Every structure is written in structure tokens, then in C-alpha cells.
Amino acid sequence: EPAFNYAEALQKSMFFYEAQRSGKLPENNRVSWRGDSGLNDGADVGLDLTGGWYDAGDHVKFGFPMAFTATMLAWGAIESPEGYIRSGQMPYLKDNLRWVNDYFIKAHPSPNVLYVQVGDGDADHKWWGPAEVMPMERPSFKVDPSCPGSDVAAETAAAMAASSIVFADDDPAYAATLVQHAKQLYTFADTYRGVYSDCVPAGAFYNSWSGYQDELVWGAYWLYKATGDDSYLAKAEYEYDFLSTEQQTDLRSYRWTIAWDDKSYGTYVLLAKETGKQKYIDDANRWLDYWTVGVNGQRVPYSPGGMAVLDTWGALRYAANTAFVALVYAKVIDDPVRKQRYHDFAVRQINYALGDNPRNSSYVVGFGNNPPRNPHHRTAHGSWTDSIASPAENRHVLYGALVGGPGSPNDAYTDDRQDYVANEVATDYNAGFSSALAMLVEEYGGTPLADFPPTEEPDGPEIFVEAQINTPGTTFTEIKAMIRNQSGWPARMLDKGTFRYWFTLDEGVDPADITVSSAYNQCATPEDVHHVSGDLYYVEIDCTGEKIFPGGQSEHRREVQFRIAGGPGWDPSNDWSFQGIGNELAPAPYIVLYDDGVPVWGTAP
Ligand SMILES: OC[C@H]1O[C@@H](O[C@H]2[C@H](O)[C@@H](O)[C@H](O[C@H]3[C@H](O)[C@@H](O)[C@H](O)O[C@@H]3CO)O[C@@H]2CO)[C@H](O)[C@@H](O)[C@@H]1O
Ligand SMILES: OC[C@H]1O[C@@H](O)[C@H](O)[C@@H](O)[C@@H]1O
Ligand SMILES: [Ca+2]
Ligand SMILES: [Ca+2]
Numbered sequence: 001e002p003a004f005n006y007a008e009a010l011q012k013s014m015f016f017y018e019a020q021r022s023g024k025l026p027e028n029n030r031v032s033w034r035g036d037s038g039l040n041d042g043a044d045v046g047l048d049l050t051g052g053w054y055d056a057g058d059h060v061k062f063g064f065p066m067a068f069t070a071t072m073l074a075w076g077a078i079e080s081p082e083g084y085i086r087s088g089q090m091p092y093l094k095d096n097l098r099w100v101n102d103y104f105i106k107a108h109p110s111p112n113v114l115y116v117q118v119g120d121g122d123a124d125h126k127w128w129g130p131a132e133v134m135p136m137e138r139p140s141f142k143v144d145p146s147c148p149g150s151d152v153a154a155e156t157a158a159a160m161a162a163s164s165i166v167f168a169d170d171d172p173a174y175a176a177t178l179v180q181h182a183k184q185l186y187t188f189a190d191t192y193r194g195v196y197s198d199c200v201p202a203g204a205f206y207n208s209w210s211g212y213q214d215e216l217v218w219g220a221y222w223l224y225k226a227t228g229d230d231s232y233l234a235k236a237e238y239e240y241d242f243l244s245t246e247q248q249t250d251l252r253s254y255r256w257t258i259a260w261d262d263k264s265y266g267t268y269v270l271l272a273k274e275t276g277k278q279k280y281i282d283d284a285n286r287w288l289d290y291w292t293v294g295v296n297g298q299r300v301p302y303s304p305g306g307m308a309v310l311d312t313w314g315a316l317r318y319a320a321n322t323a324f325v326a327l328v329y330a331k332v333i334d335d336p337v338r339k340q341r342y343h344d345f346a347v348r349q350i351n352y353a354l355g356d357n358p359r360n361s362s363y364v365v366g367f368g369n370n371p372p373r374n375p376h377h378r379t380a381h382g383s384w385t386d387s388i389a390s391p392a393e394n395r396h397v398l399y400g401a402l403v404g405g406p407g408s409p410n411d412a413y414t415d416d417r418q419d420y421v422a423n424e425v426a427t428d429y430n431a432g433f434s435s436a437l438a439m440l441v442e443e444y445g446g447t448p449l450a451d452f453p454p455t456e457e458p459d460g461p462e463i464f465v466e467a468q469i470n471t472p473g474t475t476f477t478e479i480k481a482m483i484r485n486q487s488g489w490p491a492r493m494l495d496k497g498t499f500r501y502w503f504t505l506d507e508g509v510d511p512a513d514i515t516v517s518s519a520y521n522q523c524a525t526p527e528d529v530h531h532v533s534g535d536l537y538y539v540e541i542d543c544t545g546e547k548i549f550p551g552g553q554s555e556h557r558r559e560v561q562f563r564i565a566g567g568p569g570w571d572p573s574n575d576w577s578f579q580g581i582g583n584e585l586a587p588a589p590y591i592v593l594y595d596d597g598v599p600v601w602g603t604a605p
Contacts, residue, residue, distance in 0.1 A: 004354040007087035007446025009367050010437040012400035013430050014092040015453055017073075019380070019398060020427055021099060022061060022131070023050035030453055033396050034379070035490030037131040038138065041118045042106075045140050049118050051103040056426035057377035059131045060119035063107070064196065064206045065260040067155040069427040070100045071222070072324075074162035075266075076435025079328055083438035088448045094170070097163050101178060104156050111184040112192070116152045117141040117200050128388050129551040130379045130491030141200040149196025150189040150212035154219030155263075157185035161219075161226040179226050186219050210262040213242050218263035221270050233274070240267065240280075254287040254295065257310060257322045260428045269329045284329055285338070291322055292345050303409035305358040306348055312407035313421050314429060316353050316363055320402065321432035323349040327439045350436050353402060358411045364433075365425070366399030374417040375403050376424040381417065382488035384550035388418055395459060395488050401425040402433050462487035463494055464601045467581050467588035476565035477503075477572045479581065481541070481591060483558045485548045494548040496596040498540055501564075502576035502605055505535040508569030515565050522546065522558045529564075536576075536605060539564055576605045 019031045022038040038059070042049030053069070055062040077084050077093050084090040107115035119138045127136060143149035160178040167175040195211060197203040217239045224232035243264050246253045258265040265287055272280035289295045291308055301309045310318040323346035330343040348356075355361060355368045362368025365375055374381075374394045381388070382395030394417065404422040406413045416423055463485050470480035479501065485494050505511060511529060516539050518525045523543035531537050541560050550556050572578045577590040592602035 002440075002444040002446050003351055003356065004368070005446045006350075006354075006437045006440045006444060007089075007448050009354060009364055009400075010083070010087045010434060010441055010446075011089050011092075011448040011452065012364065012367050013402075013434045013437065014089050014096060014400070016398065016400035016425070016430055017053065017096045017427065018092075020053045022052050022054055022059075032455060033382075033489045035132045035492065037134065038118070041138055042115075042140055044137075045142075047106070047109060047115070047140070049103075049107055049115055049140055051099065051106060052118070053100055053427050054131065057375065057380075057420065057424050058121075058124055059134055059378070060121050060124045060205075061117065062202060062206050063114075063116035064152045064155065064202070064208075065426070065428045066100065067104070067152065067159045068260040068263075069431040070097060070104075070159035071155065071162050072321075072428070072431035072435055073097060074159065074166050076324065076432075076438050077166050078162065079435070080438045080442045083440070083442035087438075087441050087446060094166065097166060098174075101160055101163050104160055105177070105181060108156075108181055108185065112188040113142060113144045114149070114153055114156060114185060114188070115140055115142045116149065116196060117202055121202065121205050127551065128378055128381070128383050128386050130382065130488065132379075132491040133493060133549040133551045135549070135551055135555075141202075143194075143196050143199050145188075145192045147199035148188070148192035148194035149199055150193050151208045151215045152196040153185050153189035154212065154215040157182040157189065158215070158219040158222040160185070161222040164226050179223075182223055182226065186223055189219065190216065206260065208261065210244065210264070213239065213244070214263045214267070217243065217267045221267060221274070236267070237271065237275070240271065243267070251286065252283050254283070254290050255298075255300075257291070257318050258325055258432075259318060259321055266325060269325050269332075273328070273332045281333070284333075288322075288326055288329060288338075288342055288345075291326075292341050301409045303406065303411045305352070305411040307352050307357065307406060307409070307411065308349060309406065309409045314404050314424075314426070315407050315422075316402055316405035317426075317429040317432065319349045320353060320429075320436060322346075324432045324436040324439065327436060346436060347440065350433070350440060353405065353433070359413065363403055363405045363413075365401040365403065366397050372403050372415045372423065373397075374415055374423070375401055376417050376420040377401075379491075382491070382550075384486040384488075384491075384556045386552040386555070396456065398425065399453060400430065402429045404429075456489065458487075458489050460486075461587060461601065462489065463492075463593060463595070465499060465588050465591045465593050466585045467591060468585045469581060469583055470561055471563075473563075475567055475570050476563050477570070477575070477578065478561065478563040480585070481560045481562070481588070482585060483543065483548055483560070483593065485550055485556050487550055491550045494595055494600075495546070496544045497546075497548065497593055497600075498542050498544060499591055499593045499602075500538045500540050500577075500604070501562075501591050502532075502536060502538045503564065503572070503578070504574045504576070505537055506566065506569050506571045506574065509566040511537065513567050516562055517565070518560070518562045520559065520561045523560050525562065532605075
């Protein structure tokens with residue numbers, strides 16, 4: 001039996017990617033707390049750029065890492081389809097890759113034009129709230145011959161190509177369509193050379209630090225596998241000699257790892273696996289050695305607990321990416337000592353993330369012992385006041401998400417949501433992690449959970465009305481009502497709401513003498529009352545036009561003060577909506593709130 005149920009982890013990892021979806025979600029939606037969002041994406045340029053994945057705990061759709069995530073997720077399903085089948089997650093992986101690839105198609109309106117971003121990084125990060133009510137404008141950026149971007153283009157090609165191998169047998173027509181787009185994106189990237197971050201305002205988040213030389217080899221190798229065209233392998237091997245060397249030596253870089261920006265390290269193992277040439281084997285060896293025993297006395301930092309800490313930001317992601325590529329190389333190299341080393345290194349790094357560490361706690365939200373409960377994620381938090389501090393705990397469990405984890409070699413970590421350096425999540429954090437789990441499920445096994453995902457239930461009323469007696473009176477009843485929208489299953493707009501306050505006409509009160517006034521009302525103040533039947537009448541407050549959404553202090557509520565004066569004889573004790581209303585603001589169950597005519601709160605007479 002496995003040390004950790006790698007099949008449950010993998011199963012929850014695919015749920016992650018479904019909670020990161022954007023655009024109009026399907027009927028089969030498994031995440032009950034997610035709704036339609038980013039529905040006007042592309043409007044500014046006249047295209048439909050809806051769909052895709054939000055990058056991290058934010059809502060900007062960054063195309064560079066989103067492409068990488070797709071290639072790593074595919075690569076792992078090509079190395080170990082059996083792993084995805086055993087855990088029962090193959091139909092989900094295919095559902096996720098299809099979701100992101102459909103977007104890469106939408107975003108490629110013509111051969112040499114690719115949309116690589118939707119959303120401004122600064123405008124987006126200034127607001128903390130659910131993605132279903134994003135109030136800011138989201139610009140769309142692109143790269144074309146006028147301002148090229150070989151790195152993001154060759155990666156989107158590598159992604160669509162690597163994915164076509166997954167759909168090849170299931171949907172041969174769809175597979176062909178991806179290979180086609182992929183060819184055009186690689187030609188565009190080779191013909192028009194450039195760094196995408198010089199053309200789109202993403203340099204402060206996903207800047208092209210390594211350049212495109214790595215994505216030209218990476219992109220070619222994948223078109224080679226998808227098409228079988230030997231010219232592509234020729235192209236990959238040729239471009240391989242221009243990869244970044246290190247500091248002063250002619251040795252190719254070996255001190256980092258493969259991540260959304262540098263694919264050099266993947267090509268070391270990929271070409272070595274394909275050709276078997278000593279040239280590549282040496283590189284893959286020097287790289288993976290620096291992460292295990294070391295080279296020339298230098299070794300990646302390690303914490304007393306057994307974690308490989310490469311950098312502060314997203315440490316576990318880096319160690320997870322190496323753990324996957326190490327398991328793939330462990331199968332192609334013949335050396336028994338090296339094979340054992342790389343394999344053991346990989347299982348240890350994944351086991352650390354799943355719970356085998358000094359804290360004995362998991363680092364995958366929703367999985368294991370003492371998992372994180374508050375990652376830096378806006379929609380999972382469910383804030384309704386534009387605050388990262390309120391509510392205290394995230395209102396949703398983002399099952400499957402791998403957090404940053406310890407950023408220093410001391411195994412320390414604090415579940416603080418305001419720590420985007422160690423407690424943030426992202427599509428590429430689970431990319432290499434997922435590929436490893438698939439490789440570990442095939443080898444060590446595991447069993448998925450039958451009843452998954454659990455169905456969450458709201459933490460109280462979502463859209464309701466609170467009320468209280470503003471000023472005591474015997475000839476009038478002055479109420480202070482407050483509409484609230486603190487929804488999160490999913491968060492929704494309330495732009496066409498009205499509410500009724502029922503009352504019973506009393507002896508002596510001429511309904512013609514009833515007046516409804518206010519000294520403060522953010523909605524409309526009515527002139528007359530409406531007769532239902534008999535002595536039953538109602539006052540209707542109209543708030544249609546006001547956008548009440550969970551996204552700010554004054555944005556989520558509307559205060560309505562209104563006095564219903566009837567003159568002497570007025571008696572509120574026999575009024576329906578008066579039941580329960582006191583001197584403290586508390587939900588009023590007998591004031592009915594309607595959304596476009598449909599009741600959402602309260603019970604009518
Ligand atoms: O020069 C050292 C290696 O750096 C690699 O680029 C990394 C950047 O140096 C690093 O600052 C950046 O950190 C990102 C992080 O990856 C991302 O998850 C987070 O959201 O934002 C951080 C800041 O943008 O990561 C990149 C990629 O690992 C080079 O790619 C590598 O060649 C080079 O040796
Ligand atoms: O830019 C640094 C960080 O800023 C935060 O406000 C965003 O929500 C994070 O997603 C981002 O990583
Ligand atoms: Ca690169
Ligand atoms: Ca009455």
C-alpha cells in the first residue's frame with residue numbers, strides 16, 4: 001500500500017483546474033461555488049476570448065504559463081496514461097486539456113496572431129473578490145509580426161501539439177485541428193523572433209527571463225512527436241546548441257529547473273530519451289545531479305526535513321517539476337545507481353508535499369493531515385467587502401491546490417492568506433505535480449474517492465434583508481432596512497431587486513392618508529401603497545438599477561430608511577412584515593426581496 005493516496009491527490013488536482021475555469025461554465029460543473037465570469041472577454045477587439053484558466057489567485061488570464069501548464073499536463077498523460085486511467089481521472093484530464101485548448105483556438109484568429117493576455121495585472125490585483133462580479137475592464141493583448149513573441153507562441157504550439165497526442169484516438173478530428181494550429185504558431189515563432197514581454201504588459205509577472213531559445217527547441221520536439229515529421233527533430237537538435245550556457249563555462253545551465261519560463265531542462269531529458277545521444281544524457285545528468293548529490297561541490301539547497309528549496313516563490317512547485325522530469329529520466333537511463341537516485345529523489349519530494357515532512361502536514365489544500373485552509377485565492381475566499389482580511393477563513397475549499405510551501409531551507413510555513421509568496425496557488429504549480437502523481441499512481445497505486453466533490457452549503461443567507469426600528473413612533477413605523485449580498489455559491493449580481501413590506505390596514509386609518517417618506521434611501525421612495533386583498537396592503541421599495549454585488553463595502557449593501565405614517569389609529573402589531581423587527585439590525589424574514597420578480601428571501605402572507 002502507498003504511503004499517500006496518490007490517486008486521491010491526482011483526483012483533487014483535476015478539481016483544481018476546474019475551479020480555475022473562466023467563461024461560461026457547462027451544465028456538468030462540479031464546482032458548485034463557481035459561476036459564469038469573464039463573459040465580455042474579447043469585446044474590446046471584437047473577438048470571443050472567453051474561456052481559459054485564471055492564472056493564480058487572481059483573474060488575469062496569462063498566456064505564457066497557461067500554455068506551459070497545458071504542455072506539462074499533456075506530457076504527463078503521455079508518459080503515464082495508465083496512471084490517469086487507474087485513478088479514474090483520465091476523463092477529467094481530457095476535459096481540462098480540452099477546455100484550455102479550445103481557448104488557444106479562440107485566441108488564434110489567424111496564423112500569425114495570438115492573444116496572450118486578457119486583463120490588466122494591476123487593475124486586477126487592486127480588487128479582492130469573486131470572479132463572478134469583477135467590476136473592472138479587462139483589456140486583451142496580443143502578439144503578431146508587428147510585435148512578435150516567439151516564447152509564448154512556440155509554447156502554445158508545444159501545448160496544442162502535445163495535447164493532440166492525447167486526443168489522437170478519441171477525437172482524431174480535434175487532434176488534427178490542434179496540430180494544424182500548432183504548425184502555424186511555430187512558424188510564426190521561428191519567422192518573427194522576439195520576446196513577448198516586450199510587447200504585452202506582463203513583464204512584472206511573467207517576464208521572459210530566459211528568452212525564446214528554449215521554447216524553439218521545446219516547441220519543435222513536440223511538433224515532431226505530434227506529426228512525426230523528421231524535419232522537426234532536426235530543427236530541435238539544431239537549436240539545442242544555442243541554449244544558455246552557465247556563467248563562464250561552456251556547460252549548459254544546470255542550476256535551476258524547468259518551469260513556465262525555461263524549458264531547457266525538459267529538452268535535456270526529452271532529446272536524450274529520443275535519440276539516446278551522449279550529448280543530451282550528459283546535460284540531463286549534470287542537471288539532475290545538482291539536485292541530488294551535487295556537482296563540483298555545489299548542490300541545491302536542502303532543508304533538514306528533506307525538501308529541495310530552489311527559491312522563495314513557489315518552492316514546492318520547483319521541487320515538483322524536477323520530481324516529474326526525474327521520474328521520466330529514471331526510466332530511460334540504464335545506470336542502476338543514477339536510476340535509483342533520481343527515482344528516490346522524486347518520490348521523496350512529492351511525499352514531502354503530501355505530508356511526509358517535519359510539520360507532518362499536507363501542502364495540497366483539501367488533502368491529507370492539517371492541509372492549508374486559507375490559500376491566497378480570491379474566489380475561494382469569498383470576500384464580500386473587498387478585504388483580504390474578512391472573512392477570517394476562506395469560505396471554500398480549493399481541493400487539490402498545491403501551495404508555495406516553505407521558501408527557505410528550514411521547513412517553516414504559516415497558513416497566512418496574505419502571504420502570496422508561500423501560500424499562493426496557480427495553474428503551473430499543479431502542472432508538474434500532477435504529472436508526477438500520475439507516474440506514482442501507476443507504480444504504487446491508489447484509489448479515488450467515490451463521493452467527490454462534496455457539495456458545500458452556504459454559510460448562511462446569501463442575499464437577504466436586515467431591518468430595525470429606526471425611530472419609535474405611534475402614528476408611523478419607521479424602518480431601517482439594509483439589503484445584503486454576500487453570496488458565494490456562486491457570487492451573483494442583484495441588479496433588479498425590489499422588496500415588499502406588508503401591513504394590515506387598521507381601524508380609522510384611511511389608506512389615502514398613508515404616506516411613505518424617507519430621509520435617506522439609496523433606492524426609490526414610493527408615493528402610494530398597494531392593496532392586495534381585504535385589509536392587506538404592501539409598500540414596495542424599488543432598487544432596480546442598483547448593482548448590489550459581493551465586491552466592496554458599499555457595493556454589497558443598500559440602506560433604505562422609510563417611514564409609513566398612517567395617523568392616529570395606526571397599529572403595527574397586526575402587520576405581517578413587522579414580526580420580529582426590533583431595535584438591533586438583524587435579518588427580517590417577513591420582508592420579501594425579489595430579483596426581477598422572483599422571491600429570494602422572506603415569506604409572504
Ligand atoms: O536567473 C535564474 C533563473 O531564473 C529563471 O527565471 C525565474 C525568475 O528569476 C524568478 O524571479 C521567477 O519568479 C516568478 C515565479 O516563477 C512565479 O511563479 C511568480 O508568480 O512570480 C515570480 C516573479 O515573476 O521565476 C522565473 C522562472 O523560474 C530563469 O528562467 C532561469 O533560466 C534562470 O536560470
Ligand atoms: O503581484 C504579486 C501578487 O499580488 C497579489 O495582490 C495578487 O493577488 C497575487 O496573485 C500576485 O501574485
Ligand atoms: Ca524561455
Ligand atoms: Ca396595522
